[PDB]
Amino acid sequence: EDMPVERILEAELAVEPNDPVTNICQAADKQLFTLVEWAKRIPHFSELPLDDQVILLRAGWNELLIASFSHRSIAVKDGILLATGLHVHRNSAHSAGVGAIFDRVLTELVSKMRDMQMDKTELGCLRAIVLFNPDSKGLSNPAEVEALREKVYASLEAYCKHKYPEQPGRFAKLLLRLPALRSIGLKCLEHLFFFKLIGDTPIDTFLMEMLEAP
Amino acid sequence: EDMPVERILEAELAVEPNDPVTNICQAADKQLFTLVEWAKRIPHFSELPLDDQVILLRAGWNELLIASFSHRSIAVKDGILLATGLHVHRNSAHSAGVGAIFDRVLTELVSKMRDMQMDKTELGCLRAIVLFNPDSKGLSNPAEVEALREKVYASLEAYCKHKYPEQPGRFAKLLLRLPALRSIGLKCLEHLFFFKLIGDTPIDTFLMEMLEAP
Amino acid sequence: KHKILHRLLQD
Amino acid sequence: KHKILHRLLQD
Ligand SMILES: CC(=C/C=C/C(C)=C/C(=O)O)/C=C1\CCCc2cccc(C)c21
Ligand SMILES: CC(=C/C=C/C(C)=C/C(=O)O)/C=C1\CCCc2cccc(C)c21
Numbered sequence: 001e002d003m004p005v006e007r008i009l010e011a012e013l014a015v016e017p018n019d020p021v022t023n024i025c026q027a028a029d030k031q032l033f034t035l036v037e038w039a040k041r042i043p044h045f046s047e048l049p050l051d052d053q054v055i056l057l058r059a060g061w062n063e064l065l066i067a068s069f070s071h072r073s074i075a076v077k078d079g080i081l082l083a084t085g086l087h088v089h090r091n092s093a094h095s096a097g098v099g100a101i102f103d104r105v106l107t108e109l110v111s112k113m114r115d116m117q118m119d120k121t122e123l124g125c126l127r128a129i130v131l132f133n134p135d136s137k138g139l140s141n142p143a144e145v146e147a148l149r150e151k152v153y154a155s156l157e158a159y160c161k162h163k164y165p166e167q168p169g170r171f172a173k174l175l176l177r178l179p180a181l182r183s184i185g186l187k188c189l190e191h192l193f194f195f196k197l198i199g200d201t202p203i204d205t206f207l208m209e210m211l212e213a214p
Numbered sequence: 215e216d217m218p219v220e221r222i223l224e225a226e227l228a229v230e231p232n233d234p235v236t237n238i239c240q241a242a243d244k245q246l247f248t249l250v251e252w253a254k255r256i257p258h259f260s261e262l263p264l265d266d267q268v269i270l271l272r273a274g275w276n277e278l279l280i281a282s283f284s285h286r287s288i289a290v291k292d293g294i295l296l297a298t299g300l301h302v303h304r305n306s307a308h309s310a311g312v313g314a315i316f317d318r319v320l321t322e323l324v325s326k327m328r329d330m331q332m333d334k335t336e337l338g339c340l341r342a343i344v345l346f347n348p349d350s351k352g353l354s355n356p357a358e359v360e361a362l363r364e365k366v367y368a369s370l371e372a373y374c375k376h377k378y379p380e381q382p383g384r385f386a387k388l389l390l391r392l393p394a395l396r397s398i399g400l401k402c403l404e405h406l407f408f409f410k411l412i413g414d415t416p417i418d419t420f421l422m423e424m425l426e427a428p
Numbered sequence: 429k430h431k432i433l434h435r436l437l438q439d
Numbered sequence: 440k441h442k443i444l445h446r447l448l449q450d
Contacts, residue, residue, distance in 0.1 A: 036436045046437075053437050054430055108349050135322050135394055153386045172367045175389045179396040180349055186400060206432050213429070250447045260448075267448050268441055420443050427440070 003043050003151035005159045008124040011041035016072070016120075020092045022201050025192075027082035029204035031065050034083070042128055044148055052139050059136040061210055063185035064127050070105060071123045074114040078106065101187050108180040119163075122174055125156035130181070137214075217257050217365035219373045222338040225255035230286070230334075234306045236415050239406075241296035243418035245279050248297070256342055258362055266353050273350040275424055277399035278341050284319060285337045288328040292320065315401050322394040333377075336388055339370035344395070351428075 015038045039057060040046050046053070073080040079089040093102035113123075134146035157171045164170045195201045196211055203211075229252045253271060254260050260267070287294040293303040307316035327337075348360035371385045378384045409415045410425055417425075 033436065036433070040437075050434065050437060054433055057433065057437075058430065129390075149390070150383050150387070153390075154383055157386065169364050169368055171386070172371065172389060173364070175386060176343075176363070176367075176392070178390070179392045182393040182396050183400065186397065209430060209432050247447065250444070254448075264445065264448060268444055271444065271448075272441065423441060423443050 001151060003148070003155045005121050005125060005155050007041070007043050008128055008152075008155075009121045011038050012120050012124045012127075014038070014041055016068075019201065020088045020096045021098060021195065023082060023084065023086050024088060025195070025201055025203055025207060027069070027084045027086070028065060029207040031068070031083050032061060032206040032210065035061055035064055038127075039131060042131060045131070048144070049140055052136075052141065052145065055136045055138045056131055056133060056145070058210060059133055060130045060185075062189055063130050063181050066105070066109070066185055066188065067123065067127050067130065067181055070109040071113050071118060071120075073106075073110045076110075080105070080110065098191060101184065101191060104180075104184050104187070108184060109177065112177060112180075116170070116173060118174065121159055122156065125152055125159070126174060126178070128152045129156075129175075130178070215365060217362070217369045219335050219339060219369050221255070221257050222342055222366075222369075223335045225252050226334050226338045226341075228252070228255055230282075233415065234302045234310045235312060235409065237296060237298065237300050238302060239409070239415055239417055239421060241283070241298045241300070242279060243421040245282070245297050246275060246420040246424065249275055249278055252341075253345060256345060259345070262358070263354055266350075266355065266359065269350045269352045270345055270347060270359070272424060273347055274344045274399075276403055277344050277395050280319070280323070280399055280402065281337065281341050281344065281395055284323040285327050285332060285334075287320075287324045290324075294319070294324065312405060315398065315405060318394075318398050318401070322398060323391065326391060326394075330384070330387060332388065335373055336370065339366055339373070340388060340392070342366045343370075343389075344392070 015034045036057065039053070048056075069080055069082065076087065079087055079092070081087055090099070090102060090106060093099050129149055129152050132145050132149040132152060134142045134149060136142070136145070139145055153175065156174070160171045160174070161168065193211060196203060196208075229248045250271065253267070262270075283294055283296065290301065293301055293306070295301055304313070304316060304320060307313050343363055343366050346359050346363040346366060348356045348363060350356070350359070353359055367389065370388070374385045374388070375382065407425060410417060410422075
C-alpha cells in the first residue's frame with residue numbers, strides 16, 4: 001500500500017544524469033553519496049528508524065550500485081560506463097586482474113538487461129527490493145522491512161503485465177537476476193577487501209567506511 | 215511447455231523417504247547420489263547433452279541440497295534433520311565453529327519456509343529452477359537451459375494463485391528466497407573448501423569430486 | 429561508527 | 440574428470 005512505481009522511477013531519474021580498478025573504486029565512492037539520496041526518495045524508506053536505514057544501505061550498497069552501472073552499460077559495447085563518465089572496457093579489466101568478475105557482470109547482468117530491454121521503472125523496483133532486504137542482520141523490525149519489499153514487487157508485477165502484456169513471464173525474469181546480483185555482489189566485495197589489505201589502489205572515506213565492521 | 219508440476223512433485227516424493235560437521239559432510243555425500251536420480255526425474259533434464267547435465271549439477275548441487283534439508287527441517291525445533299536420520303541442533307553447530315552459517319540457514323531458509331508453509335510442489339519447482347541455471351559457465355546451449363527455467367516458474371506461478379488464491383504474492387515470495395539460498399550456498403562451499411584444506415573431517419569420494427576443478 | 433552514513437541520512 | 444557424476448548420469 002502506497003508504493004507507486006512512479007515515485008520509484010523519479011528516484012532513479014533524480015540521481016541518474018590509469019588503473020581501471022582505481023577508477024572503479026573512485027566511482028563507487030562517488031556513487032555512495034548519490035545512493036543515500038536515492039534511498040531517501042524511495043517511499044517509506046526514511047520513515048524507518050535511522051538505524052535500520054543504516055543497516056539496509058550498508059547491507060545492499062554493493063548490489064545496488066552494481067545493478068545501476070550495469071543497466072547504465074546496456075548501450076555500451078564490451079564494458080561498462082562509470083558515473084564519472086569513464087569507460088572500462090572488458091580488455092582493460094582483464095589487464096588489471098579482475099577479468100573474471102568483470103565477465104560475470106557483462107554476461108549475467110549487462111547482457112541480460114539489454115536482451116530483455118529492462119526499463120528504468122523495472123531497474124528501480126529491483127533496486128528497491130534489494131534495498132528492502134528483510135534478512136539484513138540487526139533490523140529492529142525485519143517484518144516491517146519485509147512488508148515494504150512485498151509492496152514493491154507487487155507494484156512491479158502490476159507495472160509489468162500491463163506494460164508488457166505479451167510477456168507473462170517478465171516479472172519472474174526480472175526477479176531471477178537477483179541471485180546473480182547477490183553472487184556478483186559478494187565477489188566484488190571480496191576483491192575490495194583484498195585491495196584494501198594489499199594497500200594499493202586508493203580508497204576514499206565513504207567506500208572505506210562501508211568496509212568497516214560489521 | 216510440457217513442464218507439469220505433478221512430475222516435479224513425484225521426483226521429490228521419489229527421493230524423500232560425534233563432530234556435527236563430520237555428520238553433515240557424510241549426509242551431503244550420501245545425498246549427492248540421490249540428487250542425480252532426482253534430477254533425472256525432472257522433465258527434459260536427461261534430454262540435455264550429458265556435459266550440460268554435469269555442469270548444471272556441479273553448479274547447483276550445494277544450493278539444491280541445502281534447500282532440501284532446510285524444508286525437511288521445518289518441523290524441527292532449533293536445528294536440522296539430516297538425510298541420515300541425524301539431528302544437528304543449533305548449539306551443537308555452534309560448538310563446532312559453524313554457528314554463524316547455521317544461524318543464516320535457520321533464519322533465512324528454515325524459518326521462512328515454515329512461516330509461509332512452503333509445500334513440496336513449491337520446493338520442487340524452486341529446486342528445478344536452481345537446477346536449470348542458465349548462467350552456469352560452459353553450457354553448450356544456455357538459451358535452452360533458460361527456456362526450461364521459464365517453463366518451470368511459469369508452471370509454479372500457475373500452481374500458486376490456483377492453490378493459494380488468497381496469497382497473490384506467494385509466487386514472488388518463493389522466488390525471493392533464491393538470493394538467500396545463493397548466498398548461503400556460497401558460504402557453505404567456502405567452509406567445505408576450508409575443511410578439505412585443514413585435512414580434518416572425513417570427506418567421501420562424491421563430495422570430494424564436487425570440490426574438484428573447475 | 430558509520431559517521432558519514434549517519435550524517436547524510438539525517439540531513 | 441567427474442568420474443562418479445558421469446557414471447551415475449549415464450546409467
Ligand atoms: C562494489 C562495486 C561497486 C561499483 C561502483 C561503481 C563503479 C558505481 C558506478 O560507477 O556507478 C564494484 C567494484 C568495486 C571494487 C571491486 C570491483 C572489481 C571489479 C569490478 C567492480 C565493478 C568492482
Ligand atoms: C554444502 C552443504 C550440503 C549439505 C548436505 C546435507 C546435510 C544434505 C542432507 O542431509 O540432506 C552444506 C554443508 C556441507 C559442508 C559445510 C557446511 C557447514 C555448515 C552447515 C552445512 C549444512 C554445511
